[PDB]
From a paper:
Our previous work demonstrated that most MBLs exhibit phosphonate monoester hydrolase (PMH) activity (kcat/KM) in the range of 0.1 to 10 M−1s−1. β-lactam and phosphonate monoester hydrolyses differ in the cleaved bond (C-N vs. P-O) and the geometry of the transition state (tetrahedral vs. trigonal bipyramidal), making the PMH activity a catalytically distinct promiscuous activity for these enzymes.
For VIM2, we were only able to crystallize the dimeric fraction of VIM2-R10. This dimer reveals an unprecedented structural rearrangement: a full half of the structure exhibits a symmetrical domain-swapping between the two subunits. Four out of these six loop 3 mutations have accumulated by R5; thus, we speculate that these mutations and the loop rearrangement were the major cause of the ~25 fold increase in catalytic efficiency for PMH in VIM2-R10, compared to the wildtype. The monomeric VIM2-WT, however, evolved to exist in an equilibrium between monomer and dimer by VIM2-R10. We isolated monomeric and dimeric states, respectively, using size-exclusion chromatography, and determined their kinetic parameters. The catalytic efficiency of the dimeric state for PMH is eightfold lower compared to the monomeric state (kcat/KM = 510 and 60 M−1s−1 for the monomer vs. dimer, respectively), indicating that the dimer formation may be associated with an overall increase in solubility, rather than catalytic efficiency along the VIM2 trajectory.
Author numbering:
A (entry chain A): 30 to 61, 66 to 261
B (entry chain B): 32 to 62, 67 to 260
Write the structure that this text describes.
Protein backbone atom coordinates (compact mmCIF):
# COMPACT_ATOMS: atom_id res chain seq x y z
CA UNK A 1 0.00 0.00 0.00
CA UNK A 2 3.04 2.25 -0.44
CA UNK A 3 4.89 3.84 -3.35
CA UNK A 4 4.18 2.02 -6.60
CA UNK A 5 7.45 1.60 -8.57
CA UNK A 6 7.96 4.03 -11.45
CA UNK A 7 9.23 1.96 -14.38
CA UNK A 8 11.81 4.50 -15.59
CA UNK A 9 13.64 4.43 -12.25
CA UNK A 10 14.22 0.68 -12.34
CA UNK A 11 17.74 -0.12 -13.62
CA UNK A 12 18.30 -2.18 -16.77
CA UNK A 13 17.85 -5.88 -16.11
CA UNK A 14 15.97 -5.40 -12.85
CA UNK A 15 12.31 -6.00 -12.02
CA UNK A 16 10.18 -4.80 -9.09
CA UNK A 17 7.30 -6.66 -7.43
CA UNK A 18 4.25 -4.98 -5.93
CA UNK A 19 1.78 -7.01 -3.87
CA UNK A 20 -1.76 -5.86 -4.64
CA UNK A 21 -3.45 -8.47 -2.45
CA UNK A 22 -3.03 -12.01 -1.13
CA UNK A 23 -1.64 -14.09 -3.98
CA UNK A 24 -1.79 -11.16 -6.39
CA UNK A 25 1.28 -9.18 -7.46
CA UNK A 26 2.15 -6.71 -10.18
CA UNK A 27 5.61 -6.82 -11.74
CA UNK A 28 7.19 -3.65 -13.07
CA UNK A 29 10.16 -3.33 -15.42
CA UNK A 30 11.88 -0.62 -17.45
CA UNK A 31 10.02 0.06 -20.70
CA UNK A 32 13.04 1.16 -22.73
CA UNK A 33 5.37 -0.31 -27.26
CA UNK A 34 5.12 0.82 -23.63
CA UNK A 35 3.82 -2.04 -21.49
CA UNK A 36 5.63 -1.86 -18.13
CA UNK A 37 3.05 -3.58 -15.90
CA UNK A 38 2.20 -7.27 -15.61
CA UNK A 39 0.52 -9.61 -13.14
CA UNK A 40 1.44 -12.53 -10.90
CA UNK A 41 -1.46 -14.57 -9.51
CA UNK A 42 -1.17 -17.44 -7.03
CA UNK A 43 -2.60 -20.70 -8.36
CA UNK A 44 -2.88 -23.08 -5.42
CA UNK A 45 0.78 -23.69 -4.62
CA UNK A 46 1.92 -22.54 -8.07
CA UNK A 47 1.97 -19.20 -9.88
CA UNK A 48 0.19 -17.89 -12.97
CA UNK A 49 2.02 -15.22 -14.95
CA UNK A 50 0.18 -12.53 -16.91
CA UNK A 51 2.16 -10.79 -19.66
CA UNK A 52 5.78 -11.47 -18.70
CA UNK A 53 8.26 -8.59 -18.52
CA UNK A 54 9.31 -7.07 -21.85
CA UNK A 55 12.41 -8.74 -23.28
CA UNK A 56 14.45 -11.86 -22.59
CA UNK A 57 16.58 -10.02 -20.04
CA UNK A 58 13.71 -8.76 -17.90
CA UNK A 59 11.79 -12.05 -18.10
CA UNK A 60 14.82 -13.89 -16.75
CA UNK A 61 15.11 -11.27 -14.01
CA UNK A 62 11.39 -11.58 -13.31
CA UNK A 63 11.63 -15.33 -12.74
CA UNK A 64 14.64 -14.75 -10.49
CA UNK A 65 12.85 -12.03 -8.54
CA UNK A 66 9.74 -14.19 -8.18
CA UNK A 67 11.79 -17.08 -6.79
CA UNK A 68 13.60 -14.74 -4.39
CA UNK A 69 10.53 -12.93 -3.04
CA UNK A 70 7.71 -15.47 -3.42
CA UNK A 71 9.44 -18.84 -3.69
CA UNK A 72 6.67 -20.53 -5.66
CA UNK A 73 7.09 -22.07 -9.14
CA UNK A 74 5.76 -20.32 -12.24
CA UNK A 75 4.03 -23.09 -14.18
CA UNK A 76 1.84 -21.20 -16.66
CA UNK A 77 1.87 -17.87 -18.49
CA UNK A 78 -0.71 -15.95 -20.52
CA UNK A 79 -0.09 -13.38 -23.25
CA UNK A 80 -3.06 -11.03 -23.43
CA UNK A 81 -1.97 -9.80 -26.86
CA UNK A 82 0.90 -9.94 -29.33
CA UNK A 83 4.01 -7.80 -28.92
CA UNK A 84 7.38 -8.47 -30.57
CA UNK A 85 9.95 -8.07 -27.79
CA UNK A 86 12.69 -10.11 -29.48
CA UNK A 87 16.24 -8.79 -29.23
CA UNK A 88 19.33 -10.26 -30.88
CA UNK A 89 22.85 -9.30 -31.86
CA UNK A 90 21.66 -7.30 -34.86
CA UNK A 91 19.31 -5.32 -32.61
CA UNK A 92 22.12 -4.34 -30.24
CA UNK A 93 24.27 -3.28 -33.20
CA UNK A 94 21.35 -1.27 -34.59
CA UNK A 95 21.08 0.71 -31.35
CA UNK A 96 24.86 1.26 -31.20
CA UNK A 97 24.15 2.28 -33.91
CA UNK A 98 25.93 0.05 -36.42
CA UNK A 99 24.50 -0.55 -39.89
CA UNK A 100 24.04 -4.27 -40.54
CA UNK A 101 24.53 -5.66 -44.05
CA UNK A 102 23.16 -8.89 -45.53
CA UNK A 103 22.49 -10.50 -48.91
CA UNK A 104 18.92 -10.41 -50.27
CA UNK A 105 18.88 -14.19 -49.81
CA UNK A 106 19.79 -13.83 -46.13
CA UNK A 107 17.21 -11.09 -45.60
CA UNK A 108 14.44 -13.05 -47.33
CA UNK A 109 15.41 -16.05 -45.21
CA UNK A 110 15.14 -13.89 -42.10
CA UNK A 111 11.57 -12.92 -43.05
CA UNK A 112 10.33 -16.52 -42.94
CA UNK A 113 11.68 -16.90 -39.42
CA UNK A 114 11.36 -13.44 -37.96
CA UNK A 115 12.64 -10.00 -38.85
CA UNK A 116 11.33 -6.44 -39.56
CA UNK A 117 14.86 -5.35 -38.76
CA UNK A 118 16.36 -2.64 -41.02
CA UNK A 119 19.37 -4.04 -42.92
CA UNK A 120 21.22 -2.99 -46.06
CA UNK A 121 21.25 -5.28 -49.10
CA UNK A 122 24.51 -6.84 -50.27
CA UNK A 123 24.10 -6.99 -54.04
CA UNK A 124 25.98 -9.18 -56.51
CA UNK A 125 26.03 -12.35 -54.40
CA UNK A 126 22.91 -14.18 -55.60
CA UNK A 127 24.72 -16.82 -57.66
CA UNK A 128 27.27 -19.41 -56.50
CA UNK A 129 30.75 -18.16 -57.34
CA UNK A 130 29.84 -14.48 -57.04
CA UNK A 131 32.35 -12.19 -55.35
CA UNK A 132 32.08 -8.53 -54.36
CA UNK A 133 34.23 -6.09 -52.40
CA UNK A 134 32.79 -4.65 -49.21
CA UNK A 135 35.19 -2.27 -47.52
CA UNK A 136 38.41 -4.03 -46.45
CA UNK A 137 37.09 -7.52 -47.27
CA UNK A 138 35.81 -9.57 -50.20
CA UNK A 139 32.45 -11.32 -49.88
CA UNK A 140 31.99 -14.68 -51.59
CA UNK A 141 28.92 -16.84 -52.09
CA UNK A 142 30.15 -20.43 -52.60
CA UNK A 143 26.63 -21.81 -52.88
CA UNK A 144 24.52 -23.81 -50.44
CA UNK A 145 26.40 -25.47 -47.57
CA UNK A 146 25.60 -25.15 -43.86
CA UNK A 147 22.76 -22.86 -44.93
CA UNK A 148 21.25 -21.84 -48.28
CA UNK A 149 22.67 -18.32 -47.90
CA UNK A 150 26.02 -18.66 -46.12
CA UNK A 151 28.71 -16.22 -47.27
CA UNK A 152 32.49 -16.48 -47.11
CA UNK A 153 34.68 -13.57 -46.01
CA UNK A 154 38.25 -13.10 -47.26
CA UNK A 155 40.70 -10.50 -45.94
CA UNK A 156 43.24 -9.95 -48.77
CA UNK A 157 45.61 -7.82 -46.66
CA UNK A 158 46.29 -10.74 -44.32
CA UNK A 159 45.14 -13.59 -46.58
CA UNK A 160 42.62 -14.60 -43.91
CA UNK A 161 39.66 -16.77 -44.89
CA UNK A 162 36.59 -16.83 -42.62
CA UNK A 163 34.19 -19.61 -43.58
CA UNK A 164 31.62 -19.26 -40.82
CA UNK A 165 29.48 -22.29 -39.98
CA UNK A 166 30.21 -23.63 -43.47
CA UNK A 167 33.72 -24.61 -42.34
CA UNK A 168 34.66 -27.06 -39.56
CA UNK A 169 37.76 -27.18 -37.38
CA UNK A 170 40.10 -30.18 -37.58
CA UNK A 171 38.85 -31.72 -34.33
CA UNK A 172 35.27 -31.86 -35.61
CA UNK A 173 34.84 -35.32 -37.11
CA UNK A 174 31.05 -35.44 -37.50
CA UNK A 175 28.51 -33.04 -39.03
CA UNK A 176 26.74 -30.76 -36.55
CA UNK A 177 23.55 -28.72 -37.04
CA UNK A 178 22.74 -29.78 -40.63
CA UNK A 179 19.01 -28.89 -40.24
CA UNK A 180 19.22 -26.06 -42.80
CA UNK A 181 22.14 -27.61 -44.67
CA UNK A 182 22.38 -28.88 -48.23
CA UNK A 183 24.62 -31.89 -47.61
CA UNK A 184 24.70 -32.61 -51.35
CA UNK A 185 25.88 -29.17 -52.47
CA UNK A 186 28.16 -28.56 -49.47
CA UNK A 187 31.28 -30.28 -50.90
CA UNK A 188 30.77 -28.58 -54.28
CA UNK A 189 30.49 -25.22 -52.53
CA UNK A 190 33.77 -25.96 -50.74
CA UNK A 191 35.46 -26.69 -54.07
CA UNK A 192 34.52 -23.19 -55.23
CA UNK A 193 36.15 -21.76 -52.11
CA UNK A 194 39.34 -23.75 -52.72
CA UNK A 195 39.61 -22.63 -56.35
CA UNK A 196 38.89 -18.94 -55.68
CA UNK A 197 41.23 -18.58 -52.69
CA UNK A 198 44.41 -20.65 -53.17
CA UNK A 199 46.49 -17.93 -51.47
CA UNK A 200 44.73 -18.20 -48.10
CA UNK A 201 47.07 -18.72 -45.14
CA UNK A 202 44.69 -18.42 -42.19
CA UNK A 203 41.35 -20.25 -42.31
CA UNK A 204 38.88 -19.61 -39.50
CA UNK A 205 36.06 -22.09 -38.83
CA UNK A 206 32.70 -21.15 -37.33
CA UNK A 207 33.61 -23.00 -34.16
CA UNK A 208 37.06 -23.78 -32.82
CA UNK A 209 40.70 -23.59 -33.86
CA UNK A 210 41.94 -21.89 -37.06
CA UNK A 211 44.13 -23.67 -39.61
CA UNK A 212 45.25 -23.56 -43.23
CA UNK A 213 43.50 -24.57 -46.45
CA UNK A 214 43.37 -28.10 -45.02
CA UNK A 215 40.21 -27.09 -43.15
CA UNK A 216 38.40 -26.93 -46.49
CA UNK A 217 39.45 -30.46 -47.44
CA UNK A 218 38.65 -31.64 -43.91
CA UNK A 219 35.16 -30.11 -43.91
CA UNK A 220 34.38 -31.67 -47.29
CA UNK A 221 35.41 -35.12 -46.05
CA UNK A 222 33.26 -34.88 -42.91
CA UNK A 223 30.18 -33.71 -44.81
CA UNK A 224 30.62 -36.39 -47.47
CA UNK A 225 30.97 -39.06 -44.78
CA UNK A 226 27.52 -38.01 -43.56
CA UNK A 227 25.95 -40.17 -46.27
CA UNK A 228 24.41 -43.66 -46.15
CA UNK B 1 47.40 -19.80 -28.05
CA UNK B 2 44.00 -19.42 -29.69
CA UNK B 3 41.16 -19.45 -27.12
CA UNK B 4 39.02 -22.57 -26.87
CA UNK B 5 35.45 -21.28 -26.53
CA UNK B 6 34.54 -23.73 -23.76
CA UNK B 7 37.23 -22.30 -21.47
CA UNK B 8 35.97 -18.73 -21.83
CA UNK B 9 33.86 -17.62 -18.84
CA UNK B 10 30.14 -17.02 -19.41
CA UNK B 11 29.42 -13.50 -20.63
CA UNK B 12 32.98 -12.91 -21.80
CA UNK B 13 34.29 -12.32 -25.31
CA UNK B 14 37.92 -12.69 -26.39
CA UNK B 15 39.80 -10.84 -29.12
CA UNK B 16 42.52 -12.67 -31.04
CA UNK B 17 44.68 -10.51 -33.31
CA UNK B 18 45.59 -12.46 -36.45
CA UNK B 19 47.40 -9.62 -38.20
CA UNK B 20 47.48 -5.83 -38.43
CA UNK B 21 43.88 -4.67 -38.54
CA UNK B 22 42.53 -8.22 -38.42
CA UNK B 23 41.02 -9.75 -35.28
CA UNK B 24 38.86 -12.75 -34.55
CA UNK B 25 36.33 -12.55 -31.72
CA UNK B 26 35.49 -15.65 -29.70
CA UNK B 27 32.49 -16.16 -27.43
CA UNK B 28 31.47 -19.12 -25.29
CA UNK B 29 28.51 -21.32 -26.27
CA UNK B 30 29.05 -25.03 -25.49
CA UNK B 31 25.29 -25.41 -24.97
CA UNK B 32 26.61 -22.50 -31.94
CA UNK B 33 28.82 -20.04 -33.92
CA UNK B 34 31.72 -19.10 -31.63
CA UNK B 35 34.05 -17.31 -34.07
CA UNK B 36 33.71 -13.99 -35.90
CA UNK B 37 35.90 -11.36 -37.57
CA UNK B 38 36.95 -7.77 -36.97
CA UNK B 39 38.66 -6.04 -39.89
CA UNK B 40 40.11 -2.53 -39.78
CA UNK B 41 38.61 -0.17 -42.34
CA UNK B 42 40.79 2.93 -42.50
CA UNK B 43 40.27 4.39 -39.04
CA UNK B 44 37.04 2.45 -38.62
CA UNK B 45 36.14 -1.20 -38.01
CA UNK B 46 34.13 -3.71 -40.03
CA UNK B 47 32.41 -6.43 -38.00
CA UNK B 48 31.77 -9.90 -39.41
CA UNK B 49 29.04 -12.00 -37.77
CA UNK B 50 28.58 -10.40 -34.35
CA UNK B 51 28.66 -12.64 -31.27
CA UNK B 52 25.60 -14.82 -30.65
CA UNK B 53 23.02 -13.15 -28.43
CA UNK B 54 22.32 -9.62 -27.23
CA UNK B 55 24.57 -10.01 -24.19
CA UNK B 56 27.65 -11.27 -26.03
CA UNK B 57 27.26 -8.67 -28.78
CA UNK B 58 27.21 -5.94 -26.13
CA UNK B 59 30.27 -7.48 -24.48
CA UNK B 60 31.91 -7.69 -27.90
CA UNK B 61 31.37 -3.97 -28.56
CA UNK B 62 32.72 -3.18 -25.10
CA UNK B 63 35.77 -5.38 -25.64
CA UNK B 64 36.38 -3.78 -29.04
CA UNK B 65 36.30 -0.28 -27.55
CA UNK B 66 38.58 -1.26 -24.66
CA UNK B 67 41.23 -3.10 -26.68
CA UNK B 68 41.14 -1.48 -30.12
CA UNK B 69 39.54 1.92 -29.51
CA UNK B 70 38.18 2.30 -33.03
CA UNK B 71 34.49 2.72 -33.91
CA UNK B 72 32.48 -0.12 -35.43
CA UNK B 73 30.62 1.55 -38.29
CA UNK B 74 29.43 -1.40 -40.38
CA UNK B 75 28.56 -5.05 -39.78
CA UNK B 76 28.11 -7.99 -42.15
CA UNK B 77 25.95 -11.06 -41.58
CA UNK B 78 27.18 -14.02 -43.62
CA UNK B 79 23.95 -15.93 -42.99
CA UNK B 80 20.75 -15.70 -40.97
CA UNK B 81 21.00 -17.15 -37.47
CA UNK B 82 18.12 -16.45 -35.09
CA UNK B 83 19.64 -15.23 -31.83
CA UNK B 84 16.66 -12.92 -31.45
CA UNK B 85 14.84 -14.03 -28.30
CA UNK B 86 11.98 -12.60 -26.26
CA UNK B 87 10.05 -13.23 -23.05
CA UNK B 88 8.13 -16.25 -24.33
CA UNK B 89 11.37 -17.96 -25.33
CA UNK B 90 12.86 -17.52 -21.86
CA UNK B 91 9.66 -18.73 -20.20
CA UNK B 92 9.63 -21.78 -22.48
CA UNK B 93 13.26 -22.60 -21.67
CA UNK B 94 12.62 -22.21 -17.95
CA UNK B 95 9.77 -24.71 -17.97
CA UNK B 96 6.87 -22.26 -18.07
CA UNK B 97 3.90 -23.23 -20.24
CA UNK B 98 2.81 -20.30 -22.42
CA UNK B 99 -0.81 -19.62 -23.38
CA UNK B 100 -2.58 -17.26 -25.79
CA UNK B 101 -5.82 -16.92 -27.75
CA UNK B 102 -5.97 -18.30 -31.31
CA UNK B 103 -6.21 -14.68 -32.49
CA UNK B 104 -3.01 -13.68 -30.67
CA UNK B 105 -1.16 -16.76 -31.90
CA UNK B 106 -2.44 -16.11 -35.42
CA UNK B 107 -1.00 -12.61 -35.20
CA UNK B 108 2.21 -14.14 -33.88
CA UNK B 109 2.49 -16.35 -36.97
CA UNK B 110 2.30 -13.26 -39.17
CA UNK B 111 5.75 -11.91 -38.11
CA UNK B 112 7.47 -15.27 -37.68
CA UNK B 113 7.91 -14.62 -33.96
CA UNK B 114 7.70 -17.01 -31.01
CA UNK B 115 4.15 -18.34 -30.72
CA UNK B 116 2.81 -19.12 -27.24
CA UNK B 117 2.50 -22.91 -27.12
CA UNK B 118 -1.13 -23.55 -26.16
CA UNK B 119 -4.37 -22.03 -27.44
CA UNK B 120 -6.93 -20.32 -25.20
CA UNK B 121 -10.36 -21.30 -26.53
CA UNK B 122 -13.73 -19.63 -26.01
CA UNK B 123 -12.60 -16.03 -26.48
CA UNK B 124 -13.19 -15.31 -30.18
CA UNK B 125 -16.28 -13.14 -29.68
CA UNK B 126 -16.75 -9.80 -27.92
CA UNK B 127 -18.04 -10.43 -24.40
CA UNK B 128 -16.67 -13.96 -24.14
CA UNK B 129 -15.33 -15.07 -20.76
CA UNK B 130 -13.50 -18.23 -19.69
CA UNK B 131 -11.76 -19.40 -16.54
CA UNK B 132 -8.04 -20.08 -16.74
CA UNK B 133 -6.61 -21.20 -13.42
CA UNK B 134 -7.06 -18.51 -10.73
CA UNK B 135 -8.25 -15.83 -13.17
CA UNK B 136 -11.02 -15.07 -15.64
CA UNK B 137 -10.10 -14.15 -19.21
CA UNK B 138 -12.29 -11.63 -21.00
CA UNK B 139 -12.36 -10.49 -24.63
CA UNK B 140 -13.91 -6.99 -24.64
CA UNK B 141 -13.53 -6.60 -28.39
CA UNK B 142 -11.00 -4.60 -30.39
CA UNK B 143 -9.19 -1.84 -28.47
CA UNK B 144 -5.42 -1.26 -28.23
CA UNK B 145 -5.09 -4.33 -30.44
CA UNK B 146 -7.46 -6.66 -32.33
CA UNK B 147 -6.75 -9.46 -29.87
CA UNK B 148 -6.22 -7.79 -26.48
CA UNK B 149 -7.56 -9.74 -23.51
CA UNK B 150 -8.66 -8.52 -20.08
CA UNK B 151 -7.71 -10.41 -16.91
CA UNK B 152 -9.83 -10.42 -13.76
CA UNK B 153 -8.83 -11.90 -10.41
CA UNK B 154 -12.17 -12.60 -8.64
CA UNK B 155 -10.66 -13.43 -5.24
CA UNK B 156 -9.09 -9.97 -5.05
CA UNK B 157 -11.39 -8.09 -7.44
CA UNK B 158 -8.33 -6.98 -9.41
CA UNK B 159 -8.73 -5.93 -13.04
CA UNK B 160 -5.79 -6.01 -15.46
CA UNK B 161 -6.38 -4.47 -18.88
CA UNK B 162 -2.88 -4.40 -20.35
CA UNK B 163 -2.22 -1.65 -22.89
CA UNK B 164 -5.98 -1.36 -23.42
CA UNK B 165 -6.15 0.64 -20.17
CA UNK B 166 -4.28 3.88 -19.43
CA UNK B 167 -3.18 5.33 -16.11
CA UNK B 168 -4.65 8.64 -14.93
CA UNK B 169 -1.50 10.61 -15.75
CA UNK B 170 -1.72 9.60 -19.41
CA UNK B 171 -3.76 12.28 -21.19
CA UNK B 172 -2.77 11.38 -24.76
CA UNK B 173 -3.03 8.11 -26.68
CA UNK B 174 0.30 6.33 -26.97
CA UNK B 175 1.08 3.20 -28.97
CA UNK B 176 -1.98 3.04 -31.22
CA UNK B 177 -0.45 1.40 -34.30
CA UNK B 178 -2.67 -1.69 -34.09
CA UNK B 179 -5.55 0.05 -32.34
CA UNK B 180 -9.20 0.27 -33.30
CA UNK B 181 -9.91 3.80 -32.07
CA UNK B 182 -13.56 3.44 -33.10
CA UNK B 183 -14.27 0.22 -31.20
CA UNK B 184 -12.04 1.00 -28.21
CA UNK B 185 -14.65 2.97 -26.22
CA UNK B 186 -17.31 0.33 -26.92
CA UNK B 187 -14.94 -2.42 -25.78
CA UNK B 188 -14.27 -0.44 -22.60
CA UNK B 189 -18.02 -0.24 -21.95
CA UNK B 190 -18.21 -4.04 -22.05
CA UNK B 191 -15.46 -4.16 -19.42
CA UNK B 192 -17.43 -1.72 -17.25
CA UNK B 193 -20.51 -3.91 -17.69
CA UNK B 194 -18.93 -7.25 -16.83
CA UNK B 195 -16.85 -6.03 -13.90
CA UNK B 196 -18.62 -3.35 -11.85
CA UNK B 197 -17.25 -4.87 -8.63
CA UNK B 198 -13.58 -4.34 -9.55
CA UNK B 199 -11.64 -2.51 -6.83
CA UNK B 200 -8.12 -2.39 -8.26
CA UNK B 201 -7.40 -1.67 -11.93
CA UNK B 202 -3.89 -2.16 -13.28
CA UNK B 203 -3.01 -0.20 -16.44
CA UNK B 204 -0.41 -1.46 -18.92
CA UNK B 205 1.88 1.32 -17.76
CA UNK B 206 1.89 3.42 -14.61
CA UNK B 207 0.01 3.64 -11.33
CA UNK B 208 -2.97 1.44 -10.37
CA UNK B 209 -6.41 2.92 -9.70
CA UNK B 210 -10.10 2.09 -9.55
CA UNK B 211 -12.78 1.78 -12.22
CA UNK B 212 -12.11 5.44 -13.02
CA UNK B 213 -9.23 4.25 -15.22
CA UNK B 214 -11.79 2.74 -17.61
CA UNK B 215 -13.68 6.02 -17.95
CA UNK B 216 -10.38 7.90 -18.20
CA UNK B 217 -9.06 5.64 -20.96
CA UNK B 218 -12.26 6.00 -22.99
CA UNK B 219 -12.06 9.79 -22.72
CA UNK B 220 -8.46 9.86 -23.91
CA UNK B 221 -9.16 7.56 -26.87
CA UNK B 222 -12.28 9.49 -27.89
CA UNK B 223 -10.35 12.77 -27.73
CA UNK B 224 -7.92 11.31 -30.25
CA UNK B 225 -10.66 10.90 -32.86
ZN1 LIG C 1 1.21 -4.46 -23.82
ZN1 LIG D 1 25.36 -20.83 -39.14
Amino acid sequence: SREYPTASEIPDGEVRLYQIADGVWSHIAAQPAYPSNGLIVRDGDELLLIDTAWGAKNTAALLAEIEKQIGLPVTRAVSTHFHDDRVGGVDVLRAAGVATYASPSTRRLAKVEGTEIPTHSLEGLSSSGDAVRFGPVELFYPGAAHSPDNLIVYVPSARVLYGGCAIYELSRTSAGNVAAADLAEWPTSIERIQQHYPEAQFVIPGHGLPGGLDLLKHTSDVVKAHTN
